[PDB]
C-alpha cells in the first residue's frame, strides 16, 4: 500500500491510506528522502488515517508526501554476524563497515516468554565490588538494576562490571545505549576494540552493539531498547547461549514515550507521564528474561528524575528486578564511590539458604550498624557526643569506618580517583567486614579504610598515615 | 472604519469589520456611550473579526453595537504641559484642571531602543539609606527594583527615595501608579503640591502623574505602565533630559495580563499565568532604559504574591534590574526597617573598580559575618548560645549589632518609628560599618545600634541606655 | 545540677515547640503538593 502524509507535528506524522490500512506496529518508509525514514504506526485514527511515530527527523517532510507500507514491524538483522558491529534502531550498520549479512531478520516487537518458560535457578554472580557483593549480590541470569539521579555513578558502575564480568564471560554480550551520551558509545566501542572484546579483523567478537542516543528524536529512543533486546533474545533462544545484556539507560525508553504522548492525544497521568507507562514498561521488561532455552543477565541503568525514587518511572521499575543497586548523591557527595546506598540496595539472593549464614550475618550486621548510626546522626549533630554511652560511641566509630571500607577505587575511574583500581574477591570482602564488626581494627584510623581494596590495604595505609 | 460588536466577555470585546480591518494595537472607539470607551486590538481571529481588550468597564455594550477604528494605537499628550498634571491610561486629565494642551501626541506602543543606542556609564546613586548604599547601591540612569510581599515596605521605601532623591533632582520625574490604591495617588498628589514639586500656579512642576489603580478593569491596569512609560520617553529623547521614573507596582501590569489572558483564549502557562508573560514584561521593560540621548533612573516596586519570590511574575523580573532591594517579612517582623534582606539584595555596581575597595571590602565584610551568623542559627534555635564557641559568640554579637545598625528611621515613617528621620552619607556608612566589624564597639549593647543614623548616634544611645 | 535542670527544661520546651511547628509545616506542604500535582494534570487534560 501507499499512503500520503497529511499532517506533521514533530516526531508524530499522520498518514492517509486510500486502500489497505497498515496494521498497528507496522513500519512505513517515507518516499523521496536522502536517508531512510521509518514511521512506526501507532494508532488508527479512523477515516483510513493512521497516526505514527517517526524513527528520525521530520524536517523537510511535506504534506502529501508518499509513504509505502513495508507490511511488517521494524525487523532487524539478528544472528552472530551482529557481534563486533554497531547498529541503529532500524538495524542499519552505523560503524561504516558495510552491510550486516545475517541469514535471518527479526521484528523488534514480540510477545514475552510464557509463565511455563520461566526458570528459577539462583546462582550468585560475584563482581569484585565490596558493597554489591556483600549486601546486594547479583545473580547469574537475574535482572539487575542500577538506580541513580544525574551523575551519581550509574554508567561507571556499568563500566566496571563490563570489565570485571563481561570481559571473562564465555558467551555473548549485547550493550544497547538508549538515549545516553554519544561521546560514551565512542568511548566504549574503542575500549572494546583496544581489549579485543570487539575484533575488526576476524570473527572473534563477543559483543554486539546497538545505539539510539540523546541526539535522536523521541521515536528512535522509544525503540532502540527493543532493537537491543531483540538482538539479545536471538542468542538466548536460537543459539541457547548465556547472554549478558547491558542497557544504559532504560529510563530513556519511558521518557521517549512521555515525549510524544501528548501528541498522541492522551490525558497525562501523574507527574506528566503517559497513562500507559506501566503496561508499556511491562510488555518490554517481560522479554528481558532468562528462560529454559537460554539465560540473560541484564544490567540496566535506571535514571531517577529530580533524584526522587518515587517518580512514577524509577518507582514502576523496581518490580522488574531481582537485585537493585541504589546510588545516592548524598553518599557520592561525601566522596564515597561507588555511591551505593547500603540501606536501600537489595538482592533476592540475600538469603542464608543461598549465600550462607556467614555471608548473611555479616551483611545484616553491617546494615544494622549503619542504620544504628543513621538514627544517631541527626541527634549527635545538635546534642553532641559526650552524653553517648561508650557502647554507642563505638558504633559511631565502626560505622564511620565501614562507611569507608565500603568505598573502592574502580579500575575504570582512575581518571577520577587518582587511585589504582582494586577488585576484591568475595571472601576478602566478607572477612574484612567481619573483622571491623568484631572490633579487630578499632585502633586504626577511619581514613585508613577509605579508598582501598582488601582489608590489608587498610592496615598498610594506617602505617603510611602513621606519618 | 466601522465595525460591530459581535461578542462581549468581561474586558474582551470581539468586533467584526466589513471593509478595512484595523491592524493589531490600533485603538477603536465604541459608539453610543456616555463616556469614552477605547478598545485596543489584540489579534486577528480571521473572518474579518478582531479580538480586542477594553480600556474601561464593558457593561452596557450590546452585540451589533458600532465601533470606529481610530486609525492608530492609544495616543497621549506628551510634552512639558503634562508636568504637574494627573492623567489616565488613555491620556485624559483626571485632575479636573482642564485639557492638557500639548503640541505633540505619542502612541503608548513603541519599539525598545536599539543595541547601538545603549549606554554603559555606571555612576553610583547615593540615597542616604544605610543598607541600600552599603550593600546594593543604586546607579544613575540604572534600573532599580524593590521586591516585597504585602505590607512590607515597598511604598514607604519609594516615598523615602522620592524624598531623598526626587526632591533635589535637576530634571523631571514621572510617577506611574499601576494597580495600586487610589488613596495613595491622592496622598501623593497633595503631598507633591505641598512641597511644591507640583505647582498649580506656575509652570514649575517637576512631576507628571499617570494612574490606573486597583479599581480599574484589567485592560487599564495592563496599559497604564506603558502610558507612564511613554511620558518619560518623551523627556528622555525629545529633550535629552535626565528622568526619574517611579512605578508602584509593576507586578500589577503582569497580574492584569493574567486576568485577560484566559479571555483571549490562551492555554495557561505555570501558576495560571499567561504563556506570554516574559515577552510581555520584555517589550515593556526594554523601553524603561537610559540611552545615548537621555537618562532614565527608574525605581519600580514589585509585589511578590504569597511572599513567593519563585512566582513567575517576580521571578522573571530579576533579569531586568541593575540593583535589587529584596524586602523580607521575617526581618520586618523583627522590627528592622527597612526590612531589606542583606544577603539577597544585589547591585551590578558592587565592584571594587566602581565603589572603591574600601566600600567593596566593608560590603563583603558585612555579608560574610551575616552569612556566618545565618548558619549558626539552626543550632542557636534549639540550644541557644551556651554551647557556642567564644569565637562563634563574637560573630553572633557583631552580626546582631550589624543587623541592627542596618535599620534606620525614615522621615516618611516617623509616625511609626516614633523617631526623627535620618539620612546617612555614604562615607558615614562605610565607616560606621568598618568599626563595628573591626571590634571597636564590642562593648556597646545591641539596642544602642537599633534605629539610628550615623554610628556616632549609636554610641550616644548607649550612654542614654546607661 | 540546677543549671543543667534549667538548661534541659528549656531545650526540651524548645524541641516540642519546634516539633509542633514542623508538623504544621508538614501538613501545609502535604496539602499543597497534592493540589499542585492535581492542577498540573487538569491543565494538561483541558488543553487537549
Amino acid at each position: 500500500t501507499t499512503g500520503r502524509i497529511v499532517a506533521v507535528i514533530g516526531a508524530v506524522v499522520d498518514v492517509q491510506f486510500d486502500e489497505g490500512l497498515p496494521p498497528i506496529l507496522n513500519a512505513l518508509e517515507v518516499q523521496g528522502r536522502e536517508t531512510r525514514l521509518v514511521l512506526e504506526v501507532a494508532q488508527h485514527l479512523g477515516e483510513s488515517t493512521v497516526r505514527t511515530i517517526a524513527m528520525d527527523g521530520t524536517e523537510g517532510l511535506v504534506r502529501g508526501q508518499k509513504v509505502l507500507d513495508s507490511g511488517a514491524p521494524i525487523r532487524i538483522p539478528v544472528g552472530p554476524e551482529t557481534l563486533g558491529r554497531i547498529m541503529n534502531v532500524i538495524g542499519e550498520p552505523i560503524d561504516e563497515r558495510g552491510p550486516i549479512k545475517t541469514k535471518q531478520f527479526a521484528a523488534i516487537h514480540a510477545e514475552a516468554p510464557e509463565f511455563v518458560e520461566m526458570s528459577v535457578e539462583q546462582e550468585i554472580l560475584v563482581t569484585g565490588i565490596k558493597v554489591v557483593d556483600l549486601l546486594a549480590p547479583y545473580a547469574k541470569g537475574g535482572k539487575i538494576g542500577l538506580f541513580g539521579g544525574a551523575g551519581v555513578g550509574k554508567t561507571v558502575l556499568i563500566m566496571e562490571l563490563i570489565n570485571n564480568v563481561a570481559k571473562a564471560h564465555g558467551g555473548y554480550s549485547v550493550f544497547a545505549g538508549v538515549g545516553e551520551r554519544t561521546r560514551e558509545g565512542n568511548d566504549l566501542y574503542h575500549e572494546m576494540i583496544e581489549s579485543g572484546v570487539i575484533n575488526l579483523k576476524d570473527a572473534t567478537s563477543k559483543v554486539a552493539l546497538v545505539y539510539g542516543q540523546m541526539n535522536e528524536p523521541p521515536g528512535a529512543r522509544a525503540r532502540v531498547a527493543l532493537t537491543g533486546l531483540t538482538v539479545a533474545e536471538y542468542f538466548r533462544d536460537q543459539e541457547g547461549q548465556d547472554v549478558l545484556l547491558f542497557i544504559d539507560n532504560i529510563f530513556r525508553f519511558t521518557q521517549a514515550g512521555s515525549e510524544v504522548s501528548a501528541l498522541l492525544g492522551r490525558i497525562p497521568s501523574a507527574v506528566g507521564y503517559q497513562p500507559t507507562l506501566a503496561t508499556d514498561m511491562g510488555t518490554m521488561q517481560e522479554r528481558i528474561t532468562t528462560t529454559k532455552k537460554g539465560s540473560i543477565t541484564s544490567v540496566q541503568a535506571i535514571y531517577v528524575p529530580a533524584d526522587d525514587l518515587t517518580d512514577p518511572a524509577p518507582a514502576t521499575t523496581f518490580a522488574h528486578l531481582d537485585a537493585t543497586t541504589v546510588l545516592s548523591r548524598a553518599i557520592a557527595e561525601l566522596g564515597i564511590y561507588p555511591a551505593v546506598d547500603p540501606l536501600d540496595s537489595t538482592s533476592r539472593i540475600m538469603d542464608p539458604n543461598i549465600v550462607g549464614s556467614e555471608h548473611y550475618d555479616v551483611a545484616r550486621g553491617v546494615q544494622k550498624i549503619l542504620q544504628d548510626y543513621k538514627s544517631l546522626q541527626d541527634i549527635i549533630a545538635i546534642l553532641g557526643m559526650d552524653e553517648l554511652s561508650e557502647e554507642d560511641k563505638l558504633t559511631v566509630s565502626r560505622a564511620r569506618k565501614i562507611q569507608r571500607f565500603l568505598s573502592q577505587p574502580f579500575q575504570v575511574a582512575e581518571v577520577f580517583t587518582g587511585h589504582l583500581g582494586k577488585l576484591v574477591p568475595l571472601k576478602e570482602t566478607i572477612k574484612g567486614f567481619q573483622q571491623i564488626l568484631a572490633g579487630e581494627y578499632d585502633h586504626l584510623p577511619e581514613q585508613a579504610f577509605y579508598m582501598v581494596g582488601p582489608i590489608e590495604e587498610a592496615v598498610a595505609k594506617a602505617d603510611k598515615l602513621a606519618e | 472604519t466601522t465595525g460591530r460588536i459581535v461578542a462581549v466577555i468581561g474586558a474582551v470585546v470581539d468586533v467584526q469589520f466589513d471593509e478595512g480591518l484595523p491592524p493589531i494595537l490600533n485603538a477603536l472607539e465604541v459608539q453610543g456611550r456616555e463616556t469614552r470607551l477605547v478598545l485596543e486590538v489584540a489579534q486577528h481571529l480571521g473572518e474579518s473579526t478582531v479580538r480586542t481588550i477594553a480600556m474601561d468597564g464593558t457593561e452596557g455594550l450590546v452585540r451589533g453595537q458600532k465601533v470606529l477604528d481610530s486609525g492608530a494605537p492609544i495616543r497621549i499628550p506628551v510634552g512639558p504641559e503634562t508636568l504637574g498634571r494627573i492623567m489616565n491610561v488613555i491620556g485624559e486629565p483626571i485632575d479636573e484642571r482642564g485639557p492638557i494642551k500639548t503640541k505633540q501626541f505619542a502612541a503608548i506602543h513603541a519599539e525598545a531602543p536599539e543595541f547601538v543606542e545603549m549606554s554603559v556609564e555606571q555612576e553610583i546613586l547615593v540615597t542616604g539609606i544605610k543598607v541600600v548604599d552599603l550593600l546594593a547601591p543604586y546607579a544613575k540612569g540604572g534600573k532599580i527594583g524593590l521586591f516585597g510581599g504585602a505590607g512590607v515596605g515597598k511604598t514607604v521605601l519609594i516615598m523615602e527615595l522620592i524624598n531623598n532623591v526626587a526632591k533635589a533632582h535637576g530634571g523631571y520625574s514621572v510617577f506611574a501608579g499601576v494597580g495600586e490604591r487610589t488613596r495613595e495617588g491622592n496622598d501623593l498628589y497633595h503631598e507633591m503640591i505641598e512641597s511644591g514639586v507640583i505647582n498649580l500656579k506656575d509652570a514649575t512642576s517637576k512631576v507628571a502623574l499617570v494612574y490606573g489603580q486597583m479599581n480599574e478593569p484589567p485592560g487599564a491596569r495592563a496599559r497604564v505602565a506603558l502610558t507612564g512609560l511613554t511620558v518619560a520617553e518623551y523627556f528622555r529623547d525629545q529633550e535629552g533630559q535626565d528622568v526619574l521614573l517611579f512605578i508602584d507596582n509593576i507586578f500589577r501590569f503582569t497580574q492584569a495580563g493574567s486576568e485577560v489572558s484566559a479571555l483571549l483564549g490562551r492555554i495557561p502557562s505555570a501558576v495560571g499565568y499567561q504563556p506570554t508573560l516574559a515577552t510581555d514584561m520584555g517589550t515593556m521593560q526594554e523601553r524603561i532604559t537610559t540611552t545615548k540621548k537621555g537618562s532614565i533612573t527608574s525605581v519600580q516596586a514589585i509585589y511578590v504574591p504569597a511572599d513567593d519570590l519563585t512566582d513567575p511574575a517576580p521571578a522573571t523580573t530579576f533579569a531586568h534590574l541593575d540593583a535589587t532591594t529584596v524586602l523580607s517579612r521575617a526581618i520586618a517582623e523583627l522590627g528592622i526597617y527597612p526590612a531589606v534582606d542583606p544577603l539577597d539584595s544585589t547591585s551590578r555596581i558592587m565592584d571594587p573598580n566602581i565603589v572603591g575597595s574600601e566600600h567593596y571590602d566593608v560590603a563583603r565584610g558585612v555579608q560574610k559575618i551575616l552569612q556566618d551568623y545565618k548558619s549558626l542559627q539552626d543550632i542557636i534555635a534549639i540550644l541557644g548560645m551556651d554551647e557556642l564557641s567564644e569565637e562563634d559568640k563574637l560573630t553572633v554579637s557583631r552580626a546582631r549589632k550589624i543587623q541592627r545598625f542596618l535599620s534606620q528611621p525614615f522621615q516618611v515613617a516617623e509616625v511609626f518609628t516614633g523617631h526623627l528621620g535620618k539620612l546617612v552619607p555614604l562615607k558615614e556608612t562605610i565607616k560606621g560599618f568598618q568599626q563595628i566589624l573591626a571590634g571597636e564597639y564590642d562593648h556597646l549593647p545591641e539596642q544602642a545600634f537599633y534605629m539610628v543614623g550615623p554610628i556616632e548616634e549609636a554610641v550616644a544611645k548607649a550612654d542614654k541606655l546607661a | 545540677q540546677s543549671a543543667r535542670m534549667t538548661a534541659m527544661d528549656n531545650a526540651s520546651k524548645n524541641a516540642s515547640e519546634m516539633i509542633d511547628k514542623l508538623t504544621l509545616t508538614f501538613n501545609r506542604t502535604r496539602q499543597a503538593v497534592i493540589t499542585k500535582e492535581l492542577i498540573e494534570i487538569i491543565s494538561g487534560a483541558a488543553a487537549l
Binding site: 546534642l383 553532641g384 559526650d386 552524653e387 | 551556651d386 554551647e387 567564644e390 | 545540677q1 543549671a3 543543667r4 534549667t6 538548661a7 534541659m8
Partner: peptide
Amino acid sequence: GLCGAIHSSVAK
C-alpha cells in the same frame, strides 16, 4: 556539659 555556662564562667 549541657549545664549552660557553668564551666565557661569559671574559665573566663
